[PDB]
Amino acid sequence: TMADLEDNWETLNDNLKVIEKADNAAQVKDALTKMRAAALDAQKATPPKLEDKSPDSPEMKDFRHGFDILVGQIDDALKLANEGKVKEAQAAAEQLKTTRNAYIQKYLRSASSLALAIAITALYSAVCAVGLLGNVLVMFVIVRYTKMKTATNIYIFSLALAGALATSTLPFQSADYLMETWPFGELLCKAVLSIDYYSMFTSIFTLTMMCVDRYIAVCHPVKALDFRTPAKAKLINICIWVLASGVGVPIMVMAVTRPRDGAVVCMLQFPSPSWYWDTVTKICVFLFAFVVPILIITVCYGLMLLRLRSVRLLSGSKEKDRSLRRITRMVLVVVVAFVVCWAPIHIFVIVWTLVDIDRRDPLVVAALHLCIALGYINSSLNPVLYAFLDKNFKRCF
Amino acid sequence: LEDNWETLNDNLKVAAQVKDALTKMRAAALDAQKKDFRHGFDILVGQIDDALKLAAEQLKTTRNASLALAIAITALYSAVCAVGLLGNVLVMFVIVRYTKMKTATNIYIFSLALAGALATSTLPFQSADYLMETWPFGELLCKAVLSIDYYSMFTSIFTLTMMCVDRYIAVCHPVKALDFRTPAKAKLINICIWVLASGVGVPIMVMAVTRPRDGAVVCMLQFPSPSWYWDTVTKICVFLFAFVVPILIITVCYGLMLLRLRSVRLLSGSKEKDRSLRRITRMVLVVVVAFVVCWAPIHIFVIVWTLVDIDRRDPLVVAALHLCIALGYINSSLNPVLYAFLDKNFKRCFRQLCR
Ligand SMILES: CCN(CC)C(=O)c1ccc([C@H](c2cccc(O)c2)N2C[C@@H](C)N(Cc3ccccc3)C[C@@H]2C)cc1
Ligand SMILES: CCN(CC)C(=O)c1ccc([C@H](c2cccc(O)c2)N2C[C@@H](C)N(Cc3ccccc3)C[C@@H]2C)cc1
Numbered sequence: 001t002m003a004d005l006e007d008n009w010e011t012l013n014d015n016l017k018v019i020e021k022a023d024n025a026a027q028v029k030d031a032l033t034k035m036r037a038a039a040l041d042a043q044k045a046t047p048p049k050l051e052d053k054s055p056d057s058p059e060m061k062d063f064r065h066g067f068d069i070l071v072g073q074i075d076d077a078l079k080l081a082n083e084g085k086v087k088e089a090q091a092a093a094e095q096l097k098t099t100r101n102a103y104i105q106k107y108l109r110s111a112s113s114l115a116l117a118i119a120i121t122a123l124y125s126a127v128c129a130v131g132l133l134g135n136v137l138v139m140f141v142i143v144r145y146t147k148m149k150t151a152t153n154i155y156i157f158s159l160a161l162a163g164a165l166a167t168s169t170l171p172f173q174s175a176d177y178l179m180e181t182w183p184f185g186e187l188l189c190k191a192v193l194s195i196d197y198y199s200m201f202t203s204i205f206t207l208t209m210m211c212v213d214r215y216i217a218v219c220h221p222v223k224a225l226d227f228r229t230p231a232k233a234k235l236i237n238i239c240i241w242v243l244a245s246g247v248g249v250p251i252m253v254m255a256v257t258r259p260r261d262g263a264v265v266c267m268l269q270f271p272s273p274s275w276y277w278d279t280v281t282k283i284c285v286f287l288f289a290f291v292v293p294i295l296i297i298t299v300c301y302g303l304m305l306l307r308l309r310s311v312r313l314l315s316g317s318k319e320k321d322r323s324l325r326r327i328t329r330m331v332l333v334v335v336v337a338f339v340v341c342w343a344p345i346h347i348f349v350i351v352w353t354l355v356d357i358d359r360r361d362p363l364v365v366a367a368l369h370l371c372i373a374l375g376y377i378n379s380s381l382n383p384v385l386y387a388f389l390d391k392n393f394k395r396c397f
Numbered sequence: 398l399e400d401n402w403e404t405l406n407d408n409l410k411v412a413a414q415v416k417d418a419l420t421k422m423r424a425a426a427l428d429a430q431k432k433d434f435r436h437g438f439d440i441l442v443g444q445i446d447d448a449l450k451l452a453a454e455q456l457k458t459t460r461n462a463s464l465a466l467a468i469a470i471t472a473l474y475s476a477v478c479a480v481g482l483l484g485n486v487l488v489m490f491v492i493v494r495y496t497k498m499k500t501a502t503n504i505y506i507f508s509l510a511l512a513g514a515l516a517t518s519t520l521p522f523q524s525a526d527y528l529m530e531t532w533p534f535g536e537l538l539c540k541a542v543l544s545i546d547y548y549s550m551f552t553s554i555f556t557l558t559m560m561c562v563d564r565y566i567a568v569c570h571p572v573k574a575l576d577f578r579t580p581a582k583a584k585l586i587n588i589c590i591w592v593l594a595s596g597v598g599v600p601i602m603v604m605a606v607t608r609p610r611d612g613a614v615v616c617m618l619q620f621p622s623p624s625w626y627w628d629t630v631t632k633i634c635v636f637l638f639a640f641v642v643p644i645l646i647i648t649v650c651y652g653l654m655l656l657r658l659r660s661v662r663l664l665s666g667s668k669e670k671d672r673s674l675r676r677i678t679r680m681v682l683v684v685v686v687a688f689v690v691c692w693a694p695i696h697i698f699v700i701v702w703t704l705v706d707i708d709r710r711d712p713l714v715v716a717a718l719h720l721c722i723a724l725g726y727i728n729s730s731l732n733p734v735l736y737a738f739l740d741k742n743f744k745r746c747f748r749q750l751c752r
Contacts, residue, residue, distance in 0.1 A: 006750045014745075048752050114740050114747040118480060118731070125479030126472040134471075322407060323400075361752055381468070388464050391399060 043067035066103030131167035131380025145396035151233035159383035162203035198248035341378030401429035481517035481730025501583035512553035548598035691728030
C-alpha cells in the first residue's frame with residue numbers, strides 16, 4: 001500500500017536525524033539497522049507519481065536503483081558503527097542525506113497538510129460557537145422571558161437542550177483530531193462518547209415529534225386543542241430523554257480508552273465478536289436515527305398536503321388555507337435539511353465499514369470532517385432557526 | 398405586520414384575476430403602513446393604483462426599496478476568533494516552552510502573535526454588538542475594547558513591517574546583519590513598537606465613549622470640535638501610516654532583496670545556501686500580497702462610508718462590511734509568517750506524501 005511506503009519513508013528520515021542525536025555506537029548502529037530495513041521495503045513499493053508506470057519501466061527501475069545506492073551506503077556506515085567509530089559513521093550519514101535527494105526525492109514529494117487542519121478547526125469552532133451559544137441563548141429566553149406555557153416552547157427547549165449537549169463535545173473531538181491522541185481519559189471518554197450518541201437520538205426524535213405535533217396542529221385543529229397541552233408536551237419530551245438512555249447507557253458502558261501504537265484511543269469495546277455488534281449498532285443507528293425519522297416526517301408532510309387539498313377542494317377560506325400552507329412548506333424544509341445533513345455521514349459510516357478507503361488521504365479527511373460537521377449543523381441550527389423565526393419567541397427578544 | 402407582508406408577496410405572484418390580486422395587495426399595504434417605512438407603502442399603493450387602471454414589476458422593486466446572514470457573520474467571527482486566539486496563544490507558548498526566543502525572528506513572531514491574540518480577544522464583544530445592535534458592556538469596556546482594537550492594529554502592522562525590514566538586512570546586508578539582528582536589539586525594536594503605538598492607544602482610549610444614539614447604546618469615538626475634521630484627519634492618518642506606509646516599506650524591501658538575489662545568483666555561484674535566501678524573498682511577496690488583499694477592502698470601505706451615503710441597513714452592504722472587517726482580523730491573527738512558523742515547528746505532523 002501507499003501507507004506502508006509513507007510509513008517506511010518516514011522511519012528512514014526519522015532514523016536519519018537519530019544518527020545526529022546519537023552520542024555512542026549503540027544508538028548509531030540501531031538507527032542504521034532500522035534505516036536499512038525501511039529502504040529495502042520502500043524499494044519494493046510504488047511511488048504515487050509512478051502508480052501508473054510498469055513495475056519494469058525505466059522510472060520504476062531508477063526508483064529502486066536509488067535505494068540500492070542508499071542500502072550500500074548504510075552497509076558502509078554500519079561497519080564503522082561495528083568498529084566503534086562514531087566520527088566516521090556519523091559523517092557517512094551526510095552521504096546518505098544527499099543520496100535520498102539525488103535519486104529517490106524525484107518520486108517521493110510531500111506537502112504540508114496544515115492548511116487543512118486549520119480549515120477543519122475553523123469549521124468545528126464556528127459550528128461549536130454558533131450551536132452551543134445559540135442553543136443556550138434559546139434555552140435561557142425560554143426560561144427567563146417566554147416561560148414555556150405553550151407545547152412548542154417545550155419542544156424547542158428539548159431540541160435546544162439536545163443541540164447544546166451535541167456541540168459541547170466538539171472541543172474534545174476537535175482536540176483529538178489535532179493531537180491524534182485522547183488526553184482527557186476514560187471518565188471524559190465515557191462522558192463524551194455517551195453524550196454524542198444520546199444527544200443524537202434525543203435531537204432527532206424531538207425534531208420528529210415536533211413534526212407530528214405540527215401535523216396534529218394543522219390537520220386536526222379541533223382535536224389539537226386537547227392534545228397540544230403543555231403538560232402533554234412535557235410527558236412526550238420526558239419519554240424521549242428517558243427512552244434514548246437505551247443508547248446512552250450502552251455506549252457509556254462500552255466507551256473505553258485503550259493504547260494503539262503508543263497513542264491513546266477513545267473507542268467502543270463491543271462484546272465478542274466486536275465486528276458483528278459493531279455492524280448491528282451501525283445497521284440500527286441507520287434505521288432508527290435516519291430511516292424511521294424520515295418516514296414519519298414525510299408521512300406527516302404527505303397527510304398535511306393531502307388534508308390541505310381537502311380544505312382547498314371545498315374552496316372556503318383563502319387566508320386560513322394559505323397560512324397553514326406555510327407550515328406544510330416548512331415541514332418539507334425540515335425533511336430536505338435533515339436528509340442533506342445526515343445522508344453524507346450515514347453513507348460514510350456504511351462505505352467505511354465495507355470499502356477500505358485510505359484514512360490518511362487529505363481529500364478523504366476533508367470530506368469526512370465536512371460530513372461530521374453537517375450532522376452537528378442540523379441538530380444545533382434546527383432549534384436556533386425555529387426559535388428566531390417563531391413570532392412569539394421573536395417578541396421576548 | 399408579518400401576515401400583511403406575506404399577503405403582499407402572495408398575491409404578487411398571482412384581467413379578472415389581475416384586478417382581484419391588486420385590490421387585495423392595496424388593502425394589505427394600507428394595513429401594513431398602519432417615516433421612511435410608512436413612505437414606502439405610499440409609493441407601493443400609488444403604483445398599485447396605476448397597475449389597477451391597466452407594469453407588474455415596478456411593485457416588486459419598490460417593496461425591496463436577515464437571520465441567515467446574522468448566522469453566517471457569527472460563524473465567520475467565531476471561526477476567526479477561535480483560529481486566531483487559540484492559534485496565536487499556541488505560537489506564543491511554543492516560543493516560550495520550546496524555541497526559547499534565542500533568535501531575533503522568534504522575538505518578532507512573539508510580538509506579532511501577542512498583537513494577534515489581543516486583536517481577536519475583542520471579537521466576542523464586537524460580535525455581540527452586531528447581534529443585539531446595542532453596547533451593553535458599558536463605557537469602561539467600551540474604552541478597553543476600542544483602544545485594544547486600534548492599538549493591536551498598529552502594533553501588529555508595525556511588528557510585521559519591521560520583521561520585513563529585519564529580513565531585508567539579513568539578506569541584503571549579511572556582514573552588517575551580524576551586529577544588528579541581535580536578540581537584545583530585536584527586543585528593543587519590539588518594545589519601541591508597543592511603546593510607540595500607545596500614541597494611538599491612549600488617544601482612542603481617551604475619546605472612546607458610550608452614548609445613546611437611535612434609542613439604543615453606541616460605543617464610539619468623541620472627536621474634539623470640529624468632530625467631522627478630526628474624524629477625517631484620523632481616517633487619512635490610519636490609511637496612510639497603517640496601509641500606504643507599511644506597504645511601501647515591505648515592497649521596497651522586496652524590490653531591493655530581489656536585486657541582491659540577482660547578484661548572488663552569479664557572483665556567489667553554485668550553492669544551497671543561495672536558494673535559501675530566495676525562499677525569504679518569496680516569503681516577503683506572500684506577506685505584502687496577503688497584507689493588501691486583507692487590508693485594502695476595509696480601508697476602501699471606511700473611505701466610501703465617509704463620502705457615499707450607503708444604506709447601513711441593506712443586507713448586501715452588511716455582508717460586504719463584516720467580510721471586510723473579518724479579512725483585516727484574518728491578516729493579523731492568521732498571518733502568513735504565523736502560518737510558516739507553525740509549518741516549520743510542526744512539520745513532521747502535517748507533512749504527508751502527495752497521494
Ligand atoms: C473512522 C471515521 N468515522 C467513520 C465514518 C468516524 O469517525 C465516525 C464515527 C462515529 C460517527 C457517528 C455516527 C454517525 C452515523 C452513523 C453511525 O453509526 C455513527 N456520529 C458521531 C458524530 C458525527 N455525531 C454528531 C452529532 C450530531 C447531532 C447530534 C449529536 C451528535 C453523530 C454520531 C454519533 C460518525 C463518524
Ligand atoms: C460604520 C461602519 N464602519 C465603517 C466602514 C465600521 O464599522 C468600521 C469602524 C472602524 C474600523 C477600523 C478601521 C479600519 C480601517 C480604517 C479606519 O479608519 C478604521 N478597524 C476596526 C477593526 C476592523 N479593526 C480590526 C483589527 C485587525 C487587526 C488587528 C487589530 C484590529 C481594525 C480597525 C481599528 C473599520 C470599520
